[PDB]
Every structure is written in structure tokens, then in C-alpha cells.
DNA sequence: CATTAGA
DNA sequence: TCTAATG
């Protein structure tokens, strides 16, 4: 955690370095599962030696070890740092949908700066068209002050359209987070659950909605029960507009609302210390179920779950709130 | 790890 | 279809 640091740390930006610059894969894939065994190791590392009988620990990532253990640095991550086609790649890759994939080839042409990528605003896709579009607001969080406004919007047309709407906007936000990247909202509907061979308009009606009334200003994506896309607060009376925001919309068959509910609002660790219990317990949850646990080694059959409550009187938990939902 | 764009 | 990107 503090004690084998640097180690893991560095490592990690070797693994970056790989798998985003380059196309090394495996390498990359070497680094992080070293990486996370030092990671894991209850003791002060202190020569490559020592790190070495380490599963994963070979003597390349040994190597490194040692000259990052006598010198605080290490030539290949100071190279790294410097590399401006690798630097580039890195930074490129900030633009909402520039994957390496993107940042590399972008780069190969010349794409180094935002400006390049303005210039080419031809040789980009709508995504990361809108991705340039909102590269400032983009990067900035989200303050619950407006979260509130927002969720209340919101809330209000799911009703409006129809009253069978249930919204939930999850994620942090949720769990009382002062602030946010973008809003999770969580939806359901009656008429749809697990058979009911869906009803897309679903999905539909409110994005059309939320259009009509200006807040959901783009689409990066909208599928038949995923939609992403791009929010706004209505500019006051000026002097002061909004931030354009990253909003998500997923319908959910109701038959799996609570789970999904329960998961995406998290934390990631609650959840899997949760998922961990639920375990010994005799369960299963996963993204959308809670399953009771055979003995022949597994199991199936999907209880039924009516809020965040059940789940939990399940696994026979504490009603945990949201706020507490933090590990 | 499943969902969308795109080519 | 595959292959990228978001989450
Ligand atoms: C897991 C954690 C969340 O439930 C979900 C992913 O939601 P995310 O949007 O990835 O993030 P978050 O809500 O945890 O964080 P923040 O709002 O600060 O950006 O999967
Ligand atoms: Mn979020
Ligand atoms: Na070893
Ligand atoms: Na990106």
C-alpha cells in the first residue's frame, strides 16, 4: 500500500507505456500482474533478488528493480516521459472516444495537439467530434449543487411521459459524493422485465423527451436500451451558463432493477465485499442477480427481488444507505 | 463484459 | 463481420 509503492507504481506506468504506446500486450500484461504481486508482498522489497521469487517476477521486471532500488528513477520511464510521440499518444487520448488504437494513428498523421485534431476536425467521428466539442467541460467534475438540479429535471419528464417511469440516478452522486464525472441514471419500467421481448420505445420516449426539453443537448450514443450522451443546465439568466455534462440512460427490465441498482451504485468495494459475503451465505450476485448457492459445486435459480432491502435480507445484511456504501 | 459505432 | 471505445 505505501511500503512497496514506487515499485507497483512504476510499474504500472511500464505496463501504461506498453499497452497504450505500444502495442505489447503481453509485456504490458507483464507488468501489472508483477506489479500487483509486490503489490500484494508483506515485506520491505529490497533487491530485484528478492522480488524475483515472485511469481511473475522474471528478471526484466527483477531488472528494473534494482536500478529504480539504488536510483530513485529508472532511464527507461525518464525516456518514456520525454518521448513526445508516446507523450502525445497519452495526452490524445484524453478526447472523449480517441482510443490508442485512434491517438496512435492520429499521431502517425501528425495529429499531435488539440489544434491538430481541430484543423482534422475531417479525419475524426461524431464521438470524439463531440469529444473535441466538450474536451473542456469534459474533464471537469460534476458538483452535486447541480447534480440535485439536474436529477430533479430529469426525474420530472420520466414522470411526465409516462408515470410508470422508474429513474434512479446512481454512482457516486448517489452515495452522497460532493461531486461527480457524469450522471447515472438507472431506469426501469413495468411492462418491461427478463421475457417481454422488449419495447425500445422505452428507452425512446424519454431520451425524445429530455430533447424536447433542452437538456440532453447530443448523442454519442444511443442504442435500443443504452443511450450516452450530452446534458446541459438550462443558462440562467445569463452571465452564467452551464457546463455541457456526460449523461447515460439504460432501461432495465425490472426484474433486475435493485441488483443492477444496488451494484452501480457500488463502491466498487462494497460491492465486491458485499458480493464477497453474499458468498458464504449461500449467494451469487452478479450485475443483475442474486442466485442461491449448490453444493455440487454450483447453482442457479434467480430470487426475486423488490428493492435494495431484499437483496441485502438475502445475504442477511445491514440495510446499508448509500452514504455508507463506501467499502 | 456488454453495449454501440463504423467501415 | 470485426474491431474500437465507453463504461
Ligand atoms: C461501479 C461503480 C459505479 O457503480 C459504476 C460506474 O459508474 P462510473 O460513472 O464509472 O463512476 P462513479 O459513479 O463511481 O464515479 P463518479 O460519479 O465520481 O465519476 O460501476
Ligand atoms: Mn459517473
Ligand atoms: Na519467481
Ligand atoms: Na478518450
Request: proline share 4%; with cysteine; net charge positive.
Given at each position: 500500500?505505501?511500503?512497496?509503492?514506487?515499485?507497483?507504481?512504476?510499474?504500472?506506468?511500464?505496463?501504461?507505456?506498453?499497452?497504450?504506446?505500444?502495442?505489447?500486450?503481453?509485456?504490458?500484461?507483464?507488468?501489472?500482474?508483477?506489479?500487483?504481486?509486490?503489490?500484494?508482498?508483506?515485506?520491505?522489497?529490497?533487491?530485484?533478488?528478492?522480488?524475483?521469487?515472485?511469481?511473475?517476477?522474471?528478471?526484466?521486471i527483477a531488472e528494473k528493480i534494482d536500478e529504480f532500488l539504488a536510483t530513485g528513477k529508472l532511464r527507461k520511464l525518464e525516456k518514456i516521459r520525454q518521448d513526445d510521440t508516446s507523450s502525445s499518444i497519452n495526452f490524445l487520448t484524453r478526447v472523449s472516444g480517441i482510443?490508442?488504437?485512434?491517438?496512435?494513428?492520429?499521431?502517425?498523421?501528425?495529429?499531435?495537439?488539440?489544434?491538430?485534431?481541430?484543423?482534422?476536425?475531417?479525419?475524426?467521428?461524431?464521438?470524439?467530434?463531440?469529444?473535441?466539442?466538450?474536451?473542456?467541460?469534459?474533464?471537469?467534475?460534476?458538483?452535486?449543487?447541480?447534480?440535485?438540479?439536474?436529477?430533479?429535471?430529469?426525474?420530472?419528464?420520466?414522470?411526465?411521459?409516462?408515470?410508470?417511469?422508474?429513474?434512479?440516478?446512481?454512482?457516486?452522486?448517489?452515495?452522497?459524493a460532493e461531486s461527480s464525472g457524469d450522471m447515472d441514471v438507472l431506469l426501469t419500467h413495468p411492462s418491461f422485465t427478463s421475457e417481454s421481448t422488449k419495447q425500445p420505445k422505452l428507452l425512446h420516449q424519454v431520451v425524445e423527451q429530455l430533447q424536447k426539453v433542452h437538456?440532453?443537448?447530443?448523442?454519442?450514443?444511443?442504442?435500443?436500451?443504452?443511450?450516452?450522451?450530452?446534458?446541459?443546465?438550462?443558462?440562467?439568466?445569463?452571465?452564467?451558463?452551464?457546463?455541457?455534462?456526460?449523461?447515460?440512460?439504460?432501461?432495465?427490465?425490472?426484474?433486475?432493477?435493485?441488483?443492477?441498482?444496488?451494484?452501480?451504485?457500488?463502491?466498487?468495494?462494497?460491492?465486491?465485499?458485499?458480493?464477497?459475503?453474499?458468498?458464504?451465505?449461500?449467494?451469487?450476485?452478479?450485475?443483475?442477480?442474486?442466485?442461491?448457492?449448490?453444493?455440487?459445486?454450483?447453482?442457479?435459480?434467480?430470487?426475486?427481488?423488490?428493492?435494495?432491502?431484499?437483496?441485502?435480507?438475502?445475504?442477511?445484511?445491514?440495510?446499508?444507505?448509500?452514504?455508507?456504501?463506501?467499502?
Open positions: 500500500e505505501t511500503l512497496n509503492g514506487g515499485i507497483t507504481d512504476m510499474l504500472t506506468e511500464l505496463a501504461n507505456f506498453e499497452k497504450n504506446v505500444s502495442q505489447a500486450i503481453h509485456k504490458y500484461n507483464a507488468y501489472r500482474k508483477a506489479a500487483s504481486v509486490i503489490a500484494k508482498y508483506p515485506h520491505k522489497i529490497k533487491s530485484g533478488a528478492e522480488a524475483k521469487k515472485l511469481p511473475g517476477v522474471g528478471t526484466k482510443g490508442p488504437s485512434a491517438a496512435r494513428k492520429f499521431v502517425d498523421e501528425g495529429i499531435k495537439t488539440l489544434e491538430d485534431l481541430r484543423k482534422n476536425e475531417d479525419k475524426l467521428n461524431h464521438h470524439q467530434r463531440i469529444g473535441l466539442k466538450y474536451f473542456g467541460d469534459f474533464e471537469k467534475r460534476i458538483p452535486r449543487e447541480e447534480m440535485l438540479q439536474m436529477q430533479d429535471i430529469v426525474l420530472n419528464e420520466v414522470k411526465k411521459v409516462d408515470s410508470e417511469y422508474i429513474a434512479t440516478v446512481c454512482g457516486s452522486f448517489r452515495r452522497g437538456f440532453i443537448t447530443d448523442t454519442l450514443s444511443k442504442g435500443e436500451t443504452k443511450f450516452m450522451g450530452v446534458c446541459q443546465l438550462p443558462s440562467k439568466n445569463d452571465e452564467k451558463e452551464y457546463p455541457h455534462r456526460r449523461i447515460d440512460i439504460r432501461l432495465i427490465p425490472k426484474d433486475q432493477y435493485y441488483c443492477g441498482v444496488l451494484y452501480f451504485t457500488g463502491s466498487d468495494i462494497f460491492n465486491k465485499n458485499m458480493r464477497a459475503h453474499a458468498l458464504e451465505k449461500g449467494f451469487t450476485i452478479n450485475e443483475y442477480t442474486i442466485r442461491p448457492l449448490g453444493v455440487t459445486g454450483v447453482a442457479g435459480e434467480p430470487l426475486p427481488v423488490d428493492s435494495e432491502k431484499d437483496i441485502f435480507d438475502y445475504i442477511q445484511w445491514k440495510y446499508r444507505e448509500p452514504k455508507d456504501r463506501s467499502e
